[PDB]
Amino acid sequence: EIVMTQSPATLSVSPGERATLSCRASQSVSSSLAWYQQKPGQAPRLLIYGASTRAPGIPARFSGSGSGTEFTLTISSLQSEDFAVYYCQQYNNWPLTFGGGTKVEI
Amino acid sequence: EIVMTQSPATLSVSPGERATLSCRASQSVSSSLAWYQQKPGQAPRLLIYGASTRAPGIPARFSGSGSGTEFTLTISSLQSEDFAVYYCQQYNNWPLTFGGGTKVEI
Amino acid sequence: VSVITPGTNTSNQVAVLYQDVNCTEVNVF
Amino acid sequence: QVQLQESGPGLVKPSETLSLTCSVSGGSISSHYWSWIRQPPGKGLEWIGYIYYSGSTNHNPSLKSRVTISVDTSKNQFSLKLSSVTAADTAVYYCARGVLLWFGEPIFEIWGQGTMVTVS
Amino acid sequence: AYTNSFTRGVYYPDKVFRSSVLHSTQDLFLPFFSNVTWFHAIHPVLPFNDGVYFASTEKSNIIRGWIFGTTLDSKSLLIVNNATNVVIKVCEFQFCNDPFLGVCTFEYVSFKNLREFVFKNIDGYFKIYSKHTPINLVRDLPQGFSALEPLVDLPIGINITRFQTLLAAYYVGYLQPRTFLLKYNENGTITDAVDCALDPLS
Amino acid sequence: ETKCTLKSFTVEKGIYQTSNFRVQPTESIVRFPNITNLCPFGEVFNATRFASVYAWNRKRISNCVADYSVLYNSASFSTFKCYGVSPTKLNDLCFTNVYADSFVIRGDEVRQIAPGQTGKIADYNYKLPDDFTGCVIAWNSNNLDSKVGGNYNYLYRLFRKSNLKPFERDISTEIYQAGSTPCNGVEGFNCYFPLQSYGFQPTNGVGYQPYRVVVLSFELLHAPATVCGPKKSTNLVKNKCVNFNFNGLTGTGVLTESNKKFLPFQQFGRDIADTTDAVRDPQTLEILDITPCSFGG
Ligand SMILES: *[C@@H]1O[C@H](CO[C@@H]2O[C@@H](C)[C@@H](O)[C@@H](O)[C@@H]2O)[C@@H](O[C@@H]2O[C@H](CO)[C@@H](O[C@@H]3O[C@H](CO)[C@@H](O)[C@H](O)[C@@H]3O)[C@H](O)[C@H]2NC(C)=O)[C@H](O)[C@H]1NC(C)=O
Ligand SMILES: *[C@@H]1O[C@H](CO)[C@@H](O)[C@H](O)[C@H]1NC(C)=O
Numbered sequence: 001e002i003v004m005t006q007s008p009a010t011l012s013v014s015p016g017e018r019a020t021l022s023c024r025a026s027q028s029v030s031s032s033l034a035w036y037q038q039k040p041g042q043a044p045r046l047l048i049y050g051a052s053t054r055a056p057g058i059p060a061r062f063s064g065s066g067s068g069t070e071f072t073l074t075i076s077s078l079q080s081e082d083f084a085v086y087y088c089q090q091y092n093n094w095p096l097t098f099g100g101g102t103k104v105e106i
Numbered sequence: 107e108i109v110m111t112q113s114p115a116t117l118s119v120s121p122g123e124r125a126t127l128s129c130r131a132s133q134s135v136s137s138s139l140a141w142y143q144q145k146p147g148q149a150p151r152l153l154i155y156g157a158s159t160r161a162p163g164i165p166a167r168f169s170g171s172g173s174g175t176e177f178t179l180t181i182s183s184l185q186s187e188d189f190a191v192y193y194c195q196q197y198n199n200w201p202l203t204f205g206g207g208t209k210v211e212i
Numbered sequence: 213v214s215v216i217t218p219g220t221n222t223s224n225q226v227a228v229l230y231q232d233v234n235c236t237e238v239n240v241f
Numbered sequence: 242q243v244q245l246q247e248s249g250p251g252l253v254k255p256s257e258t259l260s261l262t263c264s265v266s267g268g269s270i271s272s273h274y275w276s277w278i279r280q281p282p283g284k285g286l287e288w289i290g291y292i293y294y295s296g297s298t299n300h301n302p303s304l305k306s307r308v309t310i311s312v313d314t315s316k317n318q319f320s321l322k323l324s325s326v327t328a329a330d331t332a333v334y335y336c337a338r339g340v341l342l343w344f345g346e347p348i349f350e351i352w353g354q355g356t357m358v359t360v361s
Numbered sequence: 362a363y364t365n366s367f368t369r370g371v372y373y374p375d376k377v378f379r380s381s382v383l384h385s386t387q388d389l390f391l392p393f394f395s396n397v398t399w400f401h402a403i404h405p406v407l408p409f410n411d412g413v414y415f416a417s418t419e420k421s422n423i424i425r426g427w428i429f430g431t432t433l434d435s436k437s438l439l440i441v442n443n444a445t446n447v448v449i450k451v452c453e454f455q456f457c458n459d460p461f462l463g464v465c466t467f468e469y470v471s472f473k474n475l476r477e478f479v480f481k482n483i484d485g486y487f488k489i490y491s492k493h494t495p496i497n498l499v500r501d502l503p504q505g506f507s508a509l510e511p512l513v514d515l516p517i518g519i520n521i522t523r524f525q526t527l528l529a530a531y532y533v534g535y536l537q538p539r540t541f542l543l544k545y546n547e548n549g550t551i552t553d554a555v556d557c558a559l560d561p562l563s
Numbered sequence: 564e565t566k567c568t569l570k571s572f573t574v575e576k577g578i579y580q581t582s583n584f585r586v587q588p589t590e591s592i593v594r595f596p597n598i599t600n601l602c603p604f605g606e607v608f609n610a611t612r613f614a615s616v617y618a619w620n621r622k623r624i625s626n627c628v629a630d631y632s633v634l635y636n637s638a639s640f641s642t643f644k645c646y647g648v649s650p651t652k653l654n655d656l657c658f659t660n661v662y663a664d665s666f667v668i669r670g671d672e673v674r675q676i677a678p679g680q681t682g683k684i685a686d687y688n689y690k691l692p693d694d695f696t697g698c699v700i701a702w703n704s705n706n707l708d709s710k711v712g713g714n715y716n717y718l719y720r721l722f723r724k725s726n727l728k729p730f731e732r733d734i735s736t737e738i739y740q741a742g743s744t745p746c747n748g749v750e751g752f753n754c755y756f757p758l759q760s761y762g763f764q765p766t767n768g769v770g771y772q773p774y775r776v777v778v779l780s781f782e783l784l785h786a787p788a789t790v791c792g793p794k795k796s797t798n799l800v801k802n803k804c805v806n807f808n809f810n811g812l813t814g815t816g817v818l819t820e821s822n823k824k825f826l827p828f829q830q831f832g833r834d835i836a837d838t839t840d841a842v843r844d845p846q847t848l849e850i851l852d853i854t855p856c857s858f859g860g
Contacts, residue, residue: 001302031633034348043335043352044286049342049601053793056599056628087286091346095302098286126743130752173741176752180743215561226562242599272603341605343633350601376785378825378832378841484692485730511828516623518732549824 002026006088006099013105019075023088023099028068032092035064035073038085038101048073080106108132112194112205119211125181129194129205134174138198141170141179144191144207154179186212243267245353247336253360259326263336263353265317270294274339274347277310277321279332280355291339291347292319331359363396364502366534370414371541371554372479372490372509380549387540389481393556397534399502406433409522410535412481417531418472418498425462426527429480437519438487441527447471451517460527467515472498472529479509481536485518502532508551585858588815591806593797595657596788596845602627607663613708613775615717616666616688617758618734624661627790630654640702641774642673647696648781657788657811662780664689667708667717669761670774673701687720692729697780705772709763717773721759785830787845796846804856810845814853821852 006023013019023033035048047058052065061082064073075082083106088099112129119125129139141154153164158171167188170179181188189212194205217226230238249261263275276291292298292310300308312319323330333355339347370391391414402423407413409429417424426441435455441448441462452465475498479490490509542555555563565574568581607622614620631653634643648656666689668676675684678695685691708714722739738746742753750756763773788810799818806815823832823841832841841852 031636032345043355044349046348046350049348050630053630054795055601056597091348093345096288096346100285128752171741171743173752173755176742178743217562220562224562228561272606340601340603341609342601342603343605344609347605348601376829378823378829380832382835485728510826518730520728520731549826 001095002029002090002093002097004088004090004097004099006102008102009100010103011105013078015078015080015106017078019078019104020072021075021086021102021104022070022072024070025090029090029092030068032090033066033071034089034091035062036087036089038087039083044087075104078104107201108135108196108199108203110194110196110203110205112208114208115206116209117211119184121184121186121212123184125184125210126178127181127192127208127210128176128178130176131196135196135198136174138196139172139177140195140197141168142193142195144193145189150193181210184210243338243351245336245338245351247334247353247356249334249356249358251357251359253326253358255327255360256325259323259330259358260320261322261334261336261356261358262318262320264319268317270312270314270317270319274341275312275319276337276339276347276349277308278335278337278349280335281329281332290321293339326358326360328360331357333357362399364399364532366391366393366395366397366532367502367504368393368506368554369416369477370479370509370534370536371506371543371551373511373551376511378549379545381547382545383542384545385540385542387538389536390539390541390556391534392537392539393559395534397502397532399530399532401530402528406523406525407533409524412479412536413524414477414479414534414536415531416475416477416502416534418496418502419474419476419529420472421529422474423529424476424526424531427524428456428460428527429521429524431520431522433523433525438517438521451519460525462527467517472496475503477507477509479536480524482517482520485516485520487515487517489513489515506553580860583858583860586804586856588804588806588856590800590803591808592799593794593808594799594844594846595791595794595796595810597796598626598628598789598791600626600628602629602790604629607665607777613704614666616668616684616719619664619666619689619732622663622665624663625659625789627661628793629790630793640700642699642701645698646678648698650698654792655794655808655811657783657791658781659784659786659788659790660782661790662782664778664780665776667704667773667775669770670703670772671770673774673776676776676778683721684719686726687723688727690727690729690731691778695780697778699776699778701774701776703769703772704775705763705765705767705769708773708775709765709767711765713765714763715760717761717763718758719761720757722757785828787830799844801851807853809842812839814839816853816855819852819854821850823850823852825850 003026004023011019011021031051033050034046036044037047038044046055047062048064049055052063054060054062061076062073063076064071066072071088073086083104085101085103087101090097109132110129117125117127137157139156140152142150143153144150152161153168154170155161158169160166160168167182168179169182170177172178177194179192189210191207191209193207196203214229214231215226216229244266245263246266247261247263250259253259271294274291274293277289279287279289281287288301289308290298290300290310292312296312298310300310307324308321310319310321335355336353337349338351339349341347374386374388389412397416425443426439429438433456435453437451437453439450439452439454449469450465451467473495475494475496477492481488488511490511492507492509494507496503540557542557543551544553546552557563564581565579566572568579602624604624635650668684672684674680675682676691676699678691679693722741724739727733736757738748738754739757740746740754742751744753746754761773801818804815804817807813807818821841825843830843831839834840839853841850843850
């Protein structure tokens with residue numbers, strides 16, 4: 001069944017610089033991913049629900065692209081309020097999986 | 107092979123009233139029947155040669171309709187000169203058959 | 213068919229003219 | 242808009258059933274799916290099942306015999322029961338609404354506040 | 362007795378705003394100067410005729426409902442104004458021979474008066490127009506001019522061939538396809554209209 | 564310019580009119596109604612069961628945000644044809660409602676699902692209006708619909724004493740009369756059951772195999788649009804010559820405040836030449852005039 005991995009587990013970042021993250025699936029998938037934000041103690045938010053498209057309510061600071069092997073997400077002009085865990089997800093087939101997630105520091 | 111039956115064998119009728127007759131084929135047939143009139147000692151006449159159509163020379167007093175199971179013919183305003191035997195016929199397949207015929211009285 | 217009328221400021225009665233047809237084939241004149 | 246609110250026990254004994262309940266406000270269970278999700282402390286998320294307005298439902302491939310879900314039209318409430326629980330089952334549980342875009346599996350968009358479960 | 366409809370039944374055909382213009386349009390309208398039937402209940406079933414004009418004059422709110430159905434046989438649309446709330450429904454519901462109020466696929470729940478309505482449907486969509494006004498009136502129908510405006514449109518689709526009303530006087534009339542010339546004022550509301558079919562002057 | 568307008572290297576004293584000018588537009592704005600949910604469109608395509616042409620199934624969609632691009636990346640549809648709108652530009656539009664109709668048909672009858680066709684389907688089962696805008700989708704489902712035991716649940720109206728109205732629905736099943744003497748609720752030569760079963764067998768030639776068909780109708784009225792493509796809104800600017808797109812309607816001009824007393828059921832007004840004069844913004848109740856940018860000889 002589909003398994004998925006997210007790397008790196010932590011990125012050190014400081015305000016006023018861009019950040020990049022990448023998540024990969026064991027097998028080819030396209031237009032069938034989501035990116036979830038997890039602030040401390042909150043419910044997840046849905047930011048990205050496909051290839052290079054933003055859910056309604058998300059500023060253009062978040063964006064992403066990808067290929068079958070690996071997909072990438074960029075956060076431009078990272079701010080102190082962007083401190084969170086980020087989780088890639090796929091839904092192409094029945095065996096749903098979440099990625100390992102990544103912490104993004106202050 | 108196709109066999110066909112005509113009922114009833116006799117209808118009692120008197121001038122100035124309509125009459126109805128019906129003939130059925132052992133199997134489904136459509137647009138492939140004829141109605142023949144047989145006055146005493148005469149040759150047959152072709153009155154109806156299909157579904158609801160009159161040969162040239164036949165007054166509109168004769169008409170008919172039908173379904174796959176059974177077909178019907180109506181003679182409106184029956185007259186004394188309409189005394190005859192009526193014979194349904196089919197021609198859809200090689201085994202031609204005539205119906206049993208019906209006498210229509212004065 | 214042609215409608216004859218005075219100005220609507222004065223009255224609303226009118227008359228009607230049927231051009232080049234016999235009146236029987238249609239007060240009259 | 243709609244609201245999701247949820248309730249259940251804080252502590253449970255080993256080797257006994259566990260039950261949770263989630264109720265919807267501001268709407269009805271007409272089209273959108275619902276799904277239960279668990280989050281172990283400091284771990285990746287895991288999906289455990291989903292059910293929709295028809296009562297037809299699908300659960301996580303693993304732990305086939307561990308989980309059941311019942312849905313009630315009255316009071317817009319659905320509940321989940323586990324046959325028994327273990328010290329590994331301590332997690333935050335969430336109920337969430339699911340929308341089916343086109344094909345595949347439905348994306349989760351609205352999430353409940355979550356409730357913690359622990360076993361001792 | 363039959364009362365002359367005089368000059369009534371103009372309604373807004375489309376919602377596009379226009380002003381200070383004369384505009385010509387052809388649609389279903391109530392012909393001018395026509396004998397609208399007058400009914401009285403002191404001391405029925407009617408043909409739908411592809412829409413109807415209804416006008417009533419009331420005290421103490423006696424007319425609180427309508428039913429629309431091909432047969433009304435209870436084998437469908439129902440509108441009823443209860444004192445507490447106004448209700449609309451679409452159901453098979455059992456109705457008496459002469460239904461009255463002793464003083465499913467859709468639902469909604471929220472002389473001195475002159476209330477006017479038009480009901481008509483096309484292509485499966487059912488439209489209701491209305492107007493209301495205070496009056497002072499005895500044993501008559503007031504001559505005047507006012508224009509109705511759309512309130513609701515319903516995707517019922519079920520075409521209805523008859524109707525019935527549930528119950529201090531009212532009038533009924535039937536629409537015909539005709540062409541009218543509408544005058545718009547600066548404010549934007551219909552002030553006058555002309556009927557092309559009536560007479561040579563028009 | 565004067566010299567080249569007269570085709571000559573010398574010009575006599577005079578006044579020559581050779582060209583015109585227009586103020587070019589300087590900014591572009593987008594202003595769409597904000598919808599706060601995704602669209603469960605897959606429900607209509609991901610469903611297991613399917614309707615029968617005698618009782619076709621309809622769904623009404625509103626308050627949605629949907630991207631049609633995936634439908635052009637997918638290759639699972641045996642047929643995909645749209646009428647009255649260009650399929651690529653659907654992402655730039657808005658509608659008041661969307662309706663989905665769904666049923667299974669004999670593949671041979673796909674010819675009948677077009678405006679103005681004729682035949683038993685187009686007259687007794689699902690008559691489509693002659694004026695239409697929408698799209699029609701088909702895919703072969705013989706693998707699932709048909710079974711080794713055959714399948715016979717699906718029925719179509721074989722006979723009918725009249726022809727349906729557009730989008731009419733009629734569950735009445737009075738015994739059809741083909742005989743001189745009418746019989747009601749009786750089985751005889753005169754009258755028989757008006758519906759026929761589709762005999763789907765798994766080895767049937769492709770023309771007889773079942774195809775699932777769905778029809779999507781876009782409906783737009785002065786009632787404000789509730790479904791829109793995934794376009795993004797943008798800030799608003801005034802009293803400058805600017806490009807604009809409101810709710811699907813493009814143009815250029817100078818937006819200004821206005822005192823037009825639009826009524827609550829109205830959205831926009833037109834001039835004698837049948838062009839937009841004023842509009843109501845989809846995010847505020849204010850009413851704006853549009854005036855063309857300056858030009859002259
Ligand atoms: C169009 O209708 C307006 C009425 O006003 C409008 O409709 C109302 C129902 C409200 O919604 C108002 O908010 C809305 O603006 C007519 O407007 C009238 O204009 C006159 C012009 O002065 C106003 O003043 C009146 O006229 C006398 C003249 O001696 C003045 O001395 C007084 O000040 C008197 O009030 C009048 O107030 C105003 N009507 C109202 C209700 O405010 C307008 O005439 C009519 N037609 C056109 C062509 O616009
Ligand atoms: C037609 O009009 C003329 C007028 O001179 C009249 O003499 C003639 O009889 C008319 N024809 C008719 C009435 O058939």
